[PDB]
Amino acid sequence: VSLMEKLKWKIKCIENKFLNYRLTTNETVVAETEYGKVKGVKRLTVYDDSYYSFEGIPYAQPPVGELRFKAPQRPTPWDGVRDCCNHKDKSVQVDFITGKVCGSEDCLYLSVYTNNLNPETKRPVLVYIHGGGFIIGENHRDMYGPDYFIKKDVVLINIQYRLGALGFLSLNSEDLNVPGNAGLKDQVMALRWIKNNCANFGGNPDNITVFGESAGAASTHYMMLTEQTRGLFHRGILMSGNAICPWANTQCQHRAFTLAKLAGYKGEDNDKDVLEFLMKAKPQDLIKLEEKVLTLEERTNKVMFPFGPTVEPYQTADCVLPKHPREMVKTAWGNSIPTMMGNTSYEGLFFTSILKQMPLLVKELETCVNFVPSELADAERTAPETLEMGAKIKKAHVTGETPTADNFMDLCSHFYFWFPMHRLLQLRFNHTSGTPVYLYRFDFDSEDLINPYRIMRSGRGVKGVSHTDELTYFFWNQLAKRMPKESREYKTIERMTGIWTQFATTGNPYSNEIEGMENVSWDPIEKSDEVYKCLNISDELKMIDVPEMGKIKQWESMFEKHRDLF
Predict the structure, then answer these.
(1) Is position 324 annotated as part of the catalytic site?
(2) Which sequence spans correspond to the domains of the chain?
(3) CATH hierarchy code of domain 1-566
(4) Does residue 467 have an active-site annotation?
(5) Looking at 138, 347, 470, 548, which residue is catalytic?
(6) In the record, which positions carry N6,N6,N6-trimethyllysine (predicted)?
């Protein structure tokens, strides 16, 4: 990331600190939790609203020392008042602006926000799980500010969970009790804390919505798949992702050794000696080296991250993913709760940055074999069957004689997002009570209001609605500003938070108290539907047929001779 964006960020960081001070009040409050009392504080928003803020509530034991890489344990109760007027640190990770490691191993906290601590009726409980590819992210308000949501009458909660190798190391040896998915197991324990404590903040424990975007979307989906959380929450919103996206799981059991070697380990590939080294290494050193773990083969086959969600090699008490995600949909309690899913209108436009450093990636579209789903393609991607699937991909996205950058980013929309969405819907249809699923397509483009991910994807002065462009209209961030109430930006904030809160409350996303939904008749998807219908969210709110349907079906035809793998 460029030196200018670095200094610009440094200055906005300094601004945000002083703003946060100014926006604080002296009105402190105390709430009960099952672990003991917590002291929160009231804060202001730039829209002259206010909210109670409880930050830094522990939901797990600090996972340091001997607890590193392990499933989380319940925190120790205290008797007195715990100070929750300040945010805790983020999970150890590489900062995308600076490039330096930041954060701490002590990161298993959550934040509770609400405009009213003593509501006359118990409120909808909304739980946000952040994305960031399971390797970056945080619940700090400089990134996920509750300022928009607190205009509505909900309780909003933002969790953290362990990222990267510290969150997702996995070892085969059953004796060492590092099966994997510790970060997911962090999410489960936060959910249980939210179940049992949200009433003390005015929340309805029988009306909880979990939602997330990107890796947060796949997390939300994982929380709907596992037996560990059955009945815990009642609605789900999958924003740009789910658990069967190609990036959303990987078998990483051999990569521990690679990571140890990068970090100075001398010895042989056996799990015990690997684990002992990794247990004593500096967290920052482990996180800094994660970038180098993936081989060239793996990157070529589109493996995006070294460590992440995985099928655990042996079942333990806290086990979360005991089979491949596709197999879990077939037995998932979450299949029978109201669900909303959706994508932006140009998801893959995100990858512009990566394309500018690697122009060669656009030649991959000449045969498109590297984009054939892994479970279908051969090792070298050279088999005649593979070139044949590759061809079907190429006819779907290459518009001219020669492949373009837009063809590429278009393909990525489908490879990483639409096609996995299509596979999940169809699969879910086969194994469900018949609760509704609603589709949206976020198609609103503005550059007047942005979020920090635009800095990352080099999204300055680039038209189209990329992956994460929608977060801008849900949370406050330190790049935001107060928008006039008549602006298209402000109106979309109202519409977006309105719909989400409407769905959180009723399990139905439609309301005519939302401006622009007058002629909207938003139906759920039926299995009988050959074409997906979704609410397209732009300057106007209009029900349409999913524009990406034709390509979606083209991708499906790769499974013609392999329908059981669909």
Answers:
(1) no
(2) 1-566
(3) 3.40.50.1820
(4) yes
(5) 347
(6) 151-152, 533
